[PDB]
Amino acid sequence: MNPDNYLYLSALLFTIGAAGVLLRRNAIVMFMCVELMLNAANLAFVNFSRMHGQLDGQVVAFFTMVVAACEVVVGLAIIMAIFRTRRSASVDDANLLKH
Amino acid sequence: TPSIEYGLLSPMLIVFGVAIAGVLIEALAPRQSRYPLQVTLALGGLIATVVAVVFVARGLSGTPGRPAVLGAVVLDAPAVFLQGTIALVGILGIMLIAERQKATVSAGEARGLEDFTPQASAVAGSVAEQLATKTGVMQTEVFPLTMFAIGGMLLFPAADDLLTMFVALEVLSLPLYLLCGLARRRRLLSQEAALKYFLLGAFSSAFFIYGAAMLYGSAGTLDLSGIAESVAAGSGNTSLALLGVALLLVGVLFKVGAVPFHSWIPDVYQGAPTSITAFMAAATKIAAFGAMLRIFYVAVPALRDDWRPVLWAIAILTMVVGTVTAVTQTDVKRMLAYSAVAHSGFILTGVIAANPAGVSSTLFYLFAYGFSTLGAFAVVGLIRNAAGDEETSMAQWAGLGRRYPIVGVVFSLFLLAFAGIPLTSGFVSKFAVFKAAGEGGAIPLVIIGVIASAVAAYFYVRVIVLMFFTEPPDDAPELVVPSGLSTAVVTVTAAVTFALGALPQPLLDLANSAETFLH
Amino acid sequence: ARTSTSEAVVFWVVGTVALVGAIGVVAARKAVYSAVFLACTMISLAVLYIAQDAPFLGVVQIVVYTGAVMMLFLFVLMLIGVDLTESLVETIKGHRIAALIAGAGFGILVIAGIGNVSVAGFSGLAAANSGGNVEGLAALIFTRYLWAFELTSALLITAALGAMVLAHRERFERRKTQRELAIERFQTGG
Amino acid sequence: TFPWLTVLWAVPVVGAAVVILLPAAQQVLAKWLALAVSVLTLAVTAVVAIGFDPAAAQYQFVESHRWIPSFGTGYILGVDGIALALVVLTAVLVPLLIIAGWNDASRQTGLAGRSVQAYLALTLAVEGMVLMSLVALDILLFYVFFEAMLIPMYFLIGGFGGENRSRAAVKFLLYNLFGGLIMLAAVIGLYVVTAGSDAFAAGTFDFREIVAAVSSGEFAVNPAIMNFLFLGFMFAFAVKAPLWPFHRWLPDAAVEATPASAVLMMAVMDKVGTFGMLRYCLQLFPDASTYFRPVVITLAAIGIVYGAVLAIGQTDVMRLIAYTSISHFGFIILGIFVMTSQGQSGSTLYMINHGISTAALFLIAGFLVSRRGSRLIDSYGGVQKVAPVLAGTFLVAGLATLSLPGLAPFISEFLVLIGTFTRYPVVAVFAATALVLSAVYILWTYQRMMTGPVRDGIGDGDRPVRDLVPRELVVVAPLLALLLVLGIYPKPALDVINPAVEHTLTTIGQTDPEPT
Amino acid sequence: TVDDKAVDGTAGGLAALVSRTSDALRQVQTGFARSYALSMLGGSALVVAAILAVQLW
């Protein structure tokens, strides 16, 4: 197998994650899709680190994991705050700000 | 051992230490004393930061900057200039954030004049929220968060490596996500703004990190100087480099607010707390454009012929869609958000210049416009309806100047600065960026920006029409001062906006000296 | 460049699982199914990391994402529903087709931009992992990237502060204790 | 040497600041302080003119300082004959406008009681910005204040003025600001071109240096770029000086604003446009100006005739005067662009005479409109019977705008027409038809308003048309005196104008055509 | 008639065009976060533009 396949998979995964953010109203599923995007980035970083014979890409993947966890937690806090008032976790429900 | 340049890193170090100390105050300080310490700790901490910056600036009078942490951070003249700008804007923004209720019979004034709900976890309008408001409680955790945001922003121009830049982006983004949802009034809109900003910011940051991955693959390095060496030497892939530049541009453009990525700015600025909006519209724009400057002047100058055509379109769109969409706006805050979009476009015109004049013009533009935006939003935060909510409906501002000539004149000054009228810092600022663009072969962008400014002057002027030329309505809003801090912020901001218009050579020499990044 | 046929098979099976997991996350009508598919994708990506001479990264992926997807499943039950089947009908007119078109175009363009890269050389990571993959990661993290390492602490603090501010409820709404409920004119029993 | 021009332009602005800072209770003292500031500015202008030597160097009282070297612009002031004429016009007019608008701001409420102070401060700020623009010898400084002067005037129209003041102010500011922004594009292009030329150490805005470089031929530029820059400058000045068809903003602003503000706009402020054409457009881009001379000449002539016709067709007195002023700016631009010593000297003298004459006529019409409650021409009749002095002064002002030889404007119009004929005879005849059209739109208005039986409510009723009060005489008599003096003995003005014009023509390689 | 309908007409038409375009663009601000995310994913436009900049097209 040619190693570049790993990148294509990432390109697919990221793409799928992006599409998910567009297609799913649930905020939690949106968080899952953002996690998919960040992990596709991590896969690309790991593949390139292997390609260049150094671990820097792996370190970046680790830091991206940290960032993904923190962003997920912040999004969960925001969604808790919204849900406690609106009793809904749909992104489309936050439609007041428009035009 | 790895040498650490604490002196160079003294900025962002004072700030992060102060944020940590503020979290400690939250953890182990009695409620009644949390706010006085935090505001004392925050403001002073930033003042120290400002001092640190100038000291660092003096240290840089010799060598043209230097790396600090074995790469991953570089304090060169542009970086220190942007850090000083961000520190000053943060001082003003925290002065806005610390404003409490003007006065009341009960002592429970609860940092509400700064639009911060006493308890964000409380359901909007619930009996719990009312009881918390009555008791005068208030979540001082806002002050640490702001520090962290400033921290991240202070780092974002100075990040010399892709990983550090991404980490700074996240560090400044998360506190802003949280802060956008803490508004005291119209809590539903503020929560919607926080959700939109979080979703789209996470989206853009995913794009940002994917672009960083592409760049790393192309160059096998994360340092911006290393990527520049790779692209210039042709050792890189040259397709992954372009793809990574595009995906990274996605993130930075989202942060600044280009049209393909602007949509978050109107809603977020409308819904977020007025003080938080004022601080953010300046500081985040400054930090994002600093990072963009570093990317396009240090990391990837060699591919100018490749990414220059793209930015043009972006800039063009940003100047057109940003301004035209503002023409029909009926909300002051929403209109100012679209103005921020258009001014991001104007900045991008100077960034496209790809010449030292471009760097100087961008730095000056960011300083002046951050000040002007902060002042405009601070003034907007004072116009209160009868119910007490910030009266943003533009029609309700009719005759506002005829009732409050001082505030009306100050807001008109800010609006004319945004429009780019001469004798305002905004005109010097637009002239700098457009001159840099013209010298850089982008005079079509100068023409398009001129037409965009002509369009935008209409909606900047409509506010003055309503404020002064129209009679006040029967239920017209009224000013709430509400304290010395807000007045000081408004006065300092207006004074800077006027001085940088009349006498710009001060700080313009500083911008000129900051024309060179360390490669 | 080429990889060991064993690695080729590992990639094919595991990346098929990962792609199907992402597709399920996007397309699963039950949010719990989305969480399970996300767990599958994360574990598959961890296996791929291991296959790419990143053992520590893969193992940490498994651990932390097991935890994170468990928490997301908890929040799915808390905020969406235990077994709620989402409609997934496009609520915004024409948004579904536009989103699919944009996603497909972006993926195609990204793949085209990637093109062939490993053809330009593919250094064996054995040189770097020599002396320990975890040892090399430690050397880089705390020497070349100690600044980002420290800033991850700021990220954690900001996350904790956001949780404490937005999600943590306070005294004005704390649930009454069983002792409190029993003592209400003797409300509970009388 | 004393910085006379710096004081000249600073005094109005400082006085405006002090006036606006006065407490609300000092309204009368505020009026008197504003008048004193205007008189001090007039005294400064008088000393500058007296010390000015028309036989001496082209630019005098020159002050030079570093202001923004980063932008290649310096604080450079200096007055030539062309600039001195407009400076004298502005300095003399501003006090007269102040004493004319003495009570224009009385009825405005709110504004913390600073309505009178705000009005006076805005008027003084307009005066100061106009003066500094006139004396500025830097393209970027001149643009800065040419654009800045719009805002005080925008406030002066929108604040105060008639019911439709808001729309009029918006149209004003947006037309003029779109033009100024096009000027900004042209100015940035000029800076870029100068930077790319070895003629200068870097991008430059020093007007004298650039003019010398282009005249000597060292600063050769591609004629297309020069054409575009000239087009930008000319478009900005054409919106500023209401060159047809860009005039459409002027009527609404003139009618809706107070008579003093409208005069300040058309009589003084709009002149900066025409002067801008004469100083920059011709001297920075002599080649482009020469190439476009046919088009601009045609536009100016069409403006003359078209504005005259519209003034004939107007039903509102003030709008009629505004269109008359548009036609007069048509004369001014026609004389400027014909590039003849007679043409340009006549155009400058016309700037002066039209400033004075439009001020007189518009202010008298404003007094009359205030006496009644309507601007409609048909709303009046037989006003001469009730207010002999008002009608007589209105007649004299109209005759001035009608260009009688006994009054100043004719001397200028003649001079312009003469200059036009030697190069474009057909255009000269087409403009000369405006001599008939002016008789029409002046004397028909006089017939409709001042003659015939006294209309109901003019001599009786609750709003009778009483004769001019002493203050209105103080305003009017000086203007009529200047008209008569510059008609009988225009030479003192020409002695100053003629040298500067020659230097201008010498600069652009143009000369009066030799007689057959 | 020319002044009221033709000369002033050009400025009126320009203002009408600007207002119509402003309303059309404001309609783009649908208020849905997912529509904004779609516009952002329009960053495929940026990617393709950068790629084509070397395609010489």
Swiss-Prot record, chain A:
GO terms for biological process: ATP synthesis coupled electron transport. Belongs to the complex I subunit 4L family. NDH-1 is composed of 14 different subunits. Subunits NuoA, H, J, K, L, M, N constitute the membrane sector of the complex. The chain crosses the membrane at residues 3-23, 28-48, 59-79. It is a multi-pass membrane protein. It catalyses: a quinone + NADH + 5 H(+)(in) = a quinol + NAD(+) + 4 H(+)(out). The keyword Hydrolase does not apply. It comes from the Bacteria. It is found in: Cell membrane. Its main location: membrane. Keywords: Cell membrane, Membrane, NAD, Quinone, Translocase, Transmembrane, Transmembrane helix, Transport. It comes from Mycolicibacterium smegmatis (strain ATCC 700084 / mc(2)155). This is NADH-quinone oxidoreductase subunit K. NDH-1 shuttles electrons from NADH, via FMN and iron-sulfur (Fe-S) centers, to quinones in the respiratory chain. The immediate electron acceptor for the enzyme in this species is believed to be a menaquinone. Couples the redox reaction to proton translocation (for every two electrons transferred, four hydrogen ions are translocated across the cytoplasmic membrane), and thus conserves the redox energy in a proton gradient. One of its GO terms (molecular function) is NADH:ubiquinone reductase (non-electrogenic) activity. Its EC number is 7.1.1.-. GO terms for cellular component: NADH dehydrogenase complex; plasma membrane.
